[model samples]
Target: RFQHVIETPEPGKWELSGYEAAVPITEKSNPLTQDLDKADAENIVRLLGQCDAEIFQESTYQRLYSESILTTMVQVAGKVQEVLKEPDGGLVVLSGGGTSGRMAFLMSVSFNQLMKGLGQKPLYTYLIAGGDRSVVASREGTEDSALHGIEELKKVAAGKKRVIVIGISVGLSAPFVAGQMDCCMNNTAVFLPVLVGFNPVSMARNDPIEDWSSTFRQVAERMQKMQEKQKAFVLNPAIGPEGLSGSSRMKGGSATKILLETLLLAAHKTVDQGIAASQRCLLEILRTFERAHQVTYSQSPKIATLMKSVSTSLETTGHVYLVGWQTLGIIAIMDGVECIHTFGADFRDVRGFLIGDHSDMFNQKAELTNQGPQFTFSQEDFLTSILPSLTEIDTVVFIFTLDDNLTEVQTIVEQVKEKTNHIQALAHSTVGQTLPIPLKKLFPSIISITWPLLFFEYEGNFIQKFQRELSTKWVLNTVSTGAHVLLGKILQNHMLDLRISNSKLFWRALAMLQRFSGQSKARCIESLLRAIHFPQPLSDDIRAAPISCHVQVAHEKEQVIPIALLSLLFRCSITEAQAHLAAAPSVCEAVRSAL
Candidate 1:
C-alpha cells in the first residue's frame, strides 16, 4: 500500500482514539519510531531510516497512491507554464511560512537560476514570512499574521500584469498562507492561486485565526470551488506523518522541495520548448526521488555513527558545527535551524556556518548580522568567531559537493583537524569520485552519497541539483533527529518540549499534553497557559491576555510544554513541575517518571 501503515488505533476505540484527535496525520506521533528515544544508536538510525523513506511513497505506489495529488502537481505545472508564456509580463510567486517559506525561497532562487541559464528573464519570486530574517533564526511570530501575507504578496506582484501565487503551508493551517490564497482569489482577473499542503481537504484546519475573519479551511474550500473551473488548484498529497510529531521540516520540507520542483521544472520545460508533460513523464521523474531515497538510507550505519558523535556534543552542552560551501551550505544551515524548532534545541546546539555566508548567499539581502553576531556570515567570520572555539566535544561536519573547489575543502578540513578530530562530513557528488581516498580518511566517519547527473531526458541539471538537495536533506534530517532522539528530546516520537511561540505551536502544546496525559483539551490548554506564565495564578488579566502575550512568555521561558505536561501528568502545581524538571536530566525521563 502507498499509504504508510497507520499505527494509531481506529476511531471506534475511544480509549485510544481520543488521543488520535490530539495530533493530526501530518503532526501525529509516528508509530515507526515511538520508542525512538529508548532505542540504541543503531535502532534509532533504522527507525529514522523508515521515517524518511516515506517521502516518495506516492511515486513508488503511484498506481495506488492519491491520484489527485499527482494530477494536481501536473495541473499546477501547466498553470505555471501558462503564466510564463503569457504575452504580458507575468510573475510566478511561491510563498509560505517557516520551513514552507524557506523552501519556497529556495525553489524561487534555483528556478530563477535556471531561467537565467536559459537566457530568459527570471519570472519567479519567493515570499518568506518575516523576510530573510526568519531563514536562519526562528521568527515564528509572523506565521500568525494574515495582514503581512496580503501586504507582502501585494508588494511583490505590485507592477506585474499577471501573477501566479503558489502558497505553501504543509499543515494547511497557517493563516499567513490562507490570507495569501484569499488575496489571489480576490484578484482572479490578474491572479491565479495554487495551494500546497500535505493534508486532505477534510483534515485542513478550521480554527478561527486570532485576527482573521475566516479559517484556513474556509479559504482553501473557496480555492477548491474555484479549482473546479480551473481558476485555482490545491496540491495536498499525503506523505504520512513526519518522523517527529508536527515537525514539518522533515517529510513536509522534503516533499515541498519535490512537489514544487516537479511542478516548476515540468512547467519550465513545457513553456521553453514543445515538451509533453504527461502523467507518465511526471511519474518517471518522481521515481528518481524514490531512487534517491534508497541511495541515502542504504548508508544508515554511517549516519548512525555521525548521529552518535553529534548527540554526544549536545549532551555535553557542546555544539554541532555544519560548515558547508555554496547552496549546500545553506541547506545545512537550514537543517540546523530546523532542529531548534523540532527538538526545542538551542540555536547554538546544531549551528550551520556557510563558507561564504554573504558573498555566496542566495538570500534576498546581502547582510543581516549587522543587527547582531547571530547573523554573521563569511569565512573570515567563521575563522575569527567560530573556529577558535572548536574542541573535542564538538562534532564538526563539512558539507560540500564534488562540484566545489576540493582544494579549499582540504585546506579547511586540515585546519579543523588542528583543533578537533571529532569531525564528520556529508559530501554530494556524481558516481566514481564522491570523495578522495585521503579526504575520506581525514574524518573518523563520513556520509558520502552519490547523485545521478541526469534523469530520463531532462534538459538541464535541475533534477540533478534538486535530487542532491533532497538527498542531503534526508541525511541531515536523519542525523539531527537521531541525535535528538539520543538526547531524549522526544517521547513516544513526540517533541514533548517544543517551544509554543505561535498559535499552531500553542495548539500543539495543548494537543501533546492531552495526547500523552489523556487530559481534556480544555484542561491541557489551561495548564499550558498557566505553566507558560509560570509561578503565577490564572488571573483574569492572564486569562484575558492576548495570544501574543502568551507566546512572548513561551519564548522567554525554558521547557514550557514540559512543565505543563508534567503538572498535569502528576496533578501538581506549575512550580512543583518545574522542580521535577530541574531534578531530572531530561524531559523524557521526568515525564516518564511522573506518568
Candidate 2:
C-alpha cells in the first residue's frame, strides 16, 4: 500500500470521500528537511502521489481493487460524521467553476446531510463560476473570470461571517479570479487553498500567507517578507500530479476533503499538531474527488447508458431537465449550456424542481402549486424539496447537496422512487447500498464527483477557457430552472421570452442585445434598437419624449412570436445595422418559419 504525506487527522472543508493515490509522486520529504526557516524546509514535508488514471476503465476495477489502499478516503468518511457541532454557525461548502468548485459542492452536500442527522444546520451556497449552475459537467471555459465569481458571491454572501473557499485550479492561472482569492486572504477570514498539485512549501500557511504559488502561498510569503507582519495563518498542501497528467482534481479533490474536514472537525487543533485549516483542507478535497470517481465510474457503462437513455427520452419528447442553484444541479444546466454553446440548440422545454425557490415572488406561487412536490421552508427558511413521484414518460433530475443523502427526509426524488421500474434515478447516492430510492430502482447509482482533477480530465475546454466569462453567464441562466423549463415547455428557448416592463426590463433588453449582436453597449443602444425598429408604448400615454427604448408585446398569446423560431425568421442576415425584429409571424408561420 502506498502511503501519502497528506495525512488527515480529519476532514471537512475538504472531504475527499474515499480516494488513495496508488503511488507517491515525490519521495517523502522529512518535515524538517527543507530550508530550516522556510516551513517546507523545516516542518511541512509533503509526499506526492500519482492517481491511477485507469480507475475509470472497466478492466481496471476488477484488477485494481487489490492495488488500492484508501486510508485517506476512509479517514474522510469518518470526518463526515462530525459537521454537527456548528448547529448555528452555518457551515456552507462553496463551489467554484472547475473540479475544485464542483467537488466542494459534492462534499458540502454530503456533509450537510451528515450534519442534519445530528441536528446540525446546513446553509451552504455552492457558488459556481456562474452562480450555482456551473457545477454539473463543465460549460466550456466558464471559470475564468473573477468578475463572474464576484457577482455570484454577491447573491449569497451574507456579510462574510466565515466564507471558506474550496478551489481546485492546478496552475492557479484563473488570474482574474486567483487575484480575488489572494485578496480574500487579507480579511482574516478562513481562505483555504487546496492546490491540486505537488508543491510542499506552503503546507503551514492557512490564510493570508503569500507564497506566490497558491493564494495562501502568496499571502504567507507577503506577510513574512514584505509586510514584516507574521502571517496570522495560512494553509497549503502538496499532492502529486494525477495519473492522467495534470489531473490534480483527482488527488487534489481527495486531499482537499481530507484537509478541509480535518480543520472543520478540529477547529481547535491549530494550537496543537495537525495542519492549519488550509493545509488540512487541501488533503480533504483530494480524497473526496478520488472517492467520488471511484464510486461513480465503477459502473460507468451502466450509468452512461442510463444517462444516455434519459437524454434520448427527453430528446424524443423534445423536453429537457433544467436544474440549478448549485453544483449537482449544474449538470443539467451545463447540459443545457452545451446544447446552446456546443450543439447550438437552445435549452427550451426543460422542466426542473427549483427555479421558483430563487425568487421571493415565485416561492409563494410555487407553494400554491399542488400539482407536484411540495418544497418546505425551514426555520432558517432553507428551501428543501419534498419527495417527488415520477412517471415513465418524464425526464427528471435534481441539483442539490450531497448531504441531502443523510436521511430519507424530503425530496422530489420520491416521484421516481415509486416508478423506478420504468424510470431513471440520479439523485446523489451513498456507498451503503441503501439509496434514496424508496422502492424499485432502474439506473445504477451514478456518483457525481466533487474531485477537481477528475471533473476537468473529462470536461475541460480550450474555448471555455478563452471565453469563460460569456460561458459563465450562459451557464448560470440555468439556475432559473423551473422557469426555464416552463419556457421550454411553451417552446421558447431563450430569456427573451420573459414578460418585460420595468427599468430592469429595459436593461435586460440592452443586455440581451449585447449578447445576440456581440456589440459594445454604446453600439447596441445606438443602432440595434433602431435596426429592430422597436416601437415602445408610453405608460398611459404620459407623453414622455425620453422613453428608454422600444416596446413590443402580444395583444394575445396566439400573437406572441416564440423566441426560438424568431431567430430563424429574424437573426439578421446582414450587419448589426440590419439585425432587428421586422414583423410578427402569422399563425400559419408560427408553426415553422424561414429565414
Candidate 3:
C-alpha cells in the first residue's frame, strides 16, 4: 500500500499524484489544511480573508454564468415532470461535454434514477455525450458538439417539456453548449444576464500576463449584451481564477451542486415545509456545510488518520466514498469528483451519495457502500406513480452528517433505522467513545480521503488525457451525444424506451440490427427488451434485451450527417427520422436530394 506516499498536510502550493500545480494561491484562502498544506494555507488563507461576497458574487458570474439557466432548468424539469406526465413517462436531461458542464446532466440523471427506483415519478431521463459508456470510458474526452444535444432532444422532446437542456463549458470547449442551453431556455422563465455573463464578449486585455480572460471573452460579453435586454437566473459561484485556476471542475462542481440543490431544496421546503420553515432548513444546510470544515478537520488525529486511510484505500482501488447526511454527501461528491480527475482516474470510482431521514440505501449502507456509481443493479421505483424501467449505476462518494447533539447510543441506532442501520452506526458521538462497531457491520469498506490534501498534493501529475476523459474536457465533436441517444434509446441495451409502442420500432430495430450485425433481422428484432424494467410508464414498454449487440452508423468526421444516414439506412420506425426521410425520397435519393 506504500506504493502510495502519505505526506503531512502542508498548506501553500502542492501537486496531485497525476496532476501539476492546478491553482496558485495568494495570501488569503489559506486555512489550516494539513501539515503538507502549510505553504498553500498562507496564500489560501490570505485570499479567503480578502474575499468579499460582492467579489465572489461578480466572480461567480464570470466563472459560471449559466447558473441562472441551470436554475431555470430545474424549474422546467419540475414543471415538465408535473405536466408532461406523458404516456411515455418523464423527461430526459442530456449533457454534451466537459465534466464541468455535463455534471448537471449526470446528477440530474442519477437523482431521477434514484427517485424513480424509490417509486417516484421521475421527471427526467439522462443521456450524456457518451451516454452510459461515458460512465465507464468517459468518452466525454472528445468534448462533443452541442448539435448532438439538439438532435437527441428532438427525438425525446416529443410531448415532453423542452427536454430541460444543458451544455457545459468549463474549458470553454463548445460555447455551443451554452448556446444550446440559451436557445432552449428561450421560452422558459430564465434570467438573461447570466447567460450573457456565461457567454460574454471578447476584449484585448492591456496586460496579457495579468488579464484573467480571453478566447470566448466575446461570448461572455455577448451574453451580457443579451442580458441588458433581459436577465436570466444563471449564477457563477466559483472563485475567480478558481481555487485551482481553470479547474472549475473543483469549485464549479461544488457551486453547481450547491446552487441547484439549494434552490431546489429551498423551493421544495417552501412548498412542503412552508416559507419560514423551508428557509430555516435552507439556512441550516448552508451553515452545516460551511461549519463542516471547522468541525471536521479538528475532530481528532484519529479522524485525520481515518480520512487518510479511507482516501488511501480508495486511491489504491481507484475508488473512494463517504456515508453521511445530505449536506456532507454533496460536499463529498464535489471533493471526490475533483480528486478523481486530479488523480487521472475514473469518476465512477469516486462515489458520494446522500441518505436522508428517508432513503432505502440508508437501510443498506453496507451493501450500498461497496459499489461504484456505474455499478448497475436492478430495482423497482415509482415514477410519479408511473413505474418504468430504471437503470441504477453506483456513483457517489459522500453522505450527510448525523446531528451530534442528539446523544445516546440507542437513539443513534434508532436514527440509523431512519437513515440506514449501517450509516447510523457510523454516526456515533465519537470514534473513541460510545459505539464500538466493526467496519463490516456498520458499513462495508468505505475508503475515505481528505479532499484538500489530494487537491494540494496531486493537482496534475498523470496524463491529462485520462483526466480530461472523466467529463472535465470540452466537446470537440457531438457525435457521442447522438450515439448516446441511440444507446439510451434502449433500456440497458434491450428495449427501445422511445418506441412508438407500435410495430414500427420493432421493424426498425429488426432491420437495423440485421443490416449491421449481418445476423438475422428476426433474431435482432427478437432481442428488443420487451419487459422494460416493468413498463408501467410507457404502456407498451417491453424488456427486449440489453443492447446485446452495438449498432452504429459512422461517418467519422461526419457523425451528425452519418446519424441521419443511419436513421434512413436502417429505416427505424422513429417518427422524426421517418418524417424527415418521408419528406425526402430514399436514402440514396435523400443523400443526393438533401445534399
Better of 2 and 3 by lDDT: 2
Q: What is the Cα-based lDDT of residue 256 in candidate 2?
A: 46
- For model 1, residues 1-595, the per-residue Cα lDDT tens digits are 1011123343346455634554567877776877877998789777777877776664343221356666877788887888778736699988889889888878877877788787887788888888887777777878888888988899988878889999999999888889999989988888999998888766777776777788898999999899999889988777888877788988888888877787777888797776946677677677777788888888888988888888888998888888878667667778887776667887778877768534422445653655565564456756887888888777888888888888888888888888887887888888666577678779546677876567455543778777877888877888888888887777888888687767788767766776677666557767887988876778878877777778877864667878888888788887788889999988889888987
By TM-score, rank the candidates, best first: 1, 3, 2
- lDDT at position 525, candidate 2: 50
Local distance difference test, each candidate: 0.78, 0.34, 0.32
Candidate 3 ranges with C-alpha deviation above 4 Å: 1-98, 105-120, 125-127, 161-176, 185-232, 269-285, 300-341, 345-595
> Residue by residue across 151-201, what tens digits does model 3's lDDT show?
545555666433444334433333334445544545443211122112122
Which 10-residue window of candidate 2 scores lowest in summed lDDT? 41-50
* Residues 1-595, model 2: lDDT tens digits: 0011122222242233221221223222122222211211001111111132222222332121212212222232223222223334333444455545654555555445434544545644455554333342223244544555545544454454544443444333332244445544455343322222233434322222112334434533553342223212223334434322222343444444444443344342221233333323333333443444344344344343444444455545534443333333423333343333212233343333332222321102332343231122121112233223234554544443334432332343453346433334343322233444432233345333232222322112211111121122212222222222222321121233332222222333344444333434444453323323334422423222222223332111121222323432354322321233234332223323332
Pairs with backbone N, CA or C atoms under 3 Å apart (clashes), candidate 1: none
Quick one: best TM-score, which candidate? 1
Task: State the weakest 10-residue window (summed lDDT) of model 1.
Answer: 1-10
In model 2, which regions exceed 4 Å deviation?
Answer: 1-176, 185-295, 314-317, 320-345, 349-422, 426-438, 441-595
Q: After superposition on all CA atoms, how large is the RMSD of candidate 1?
A: 4.2
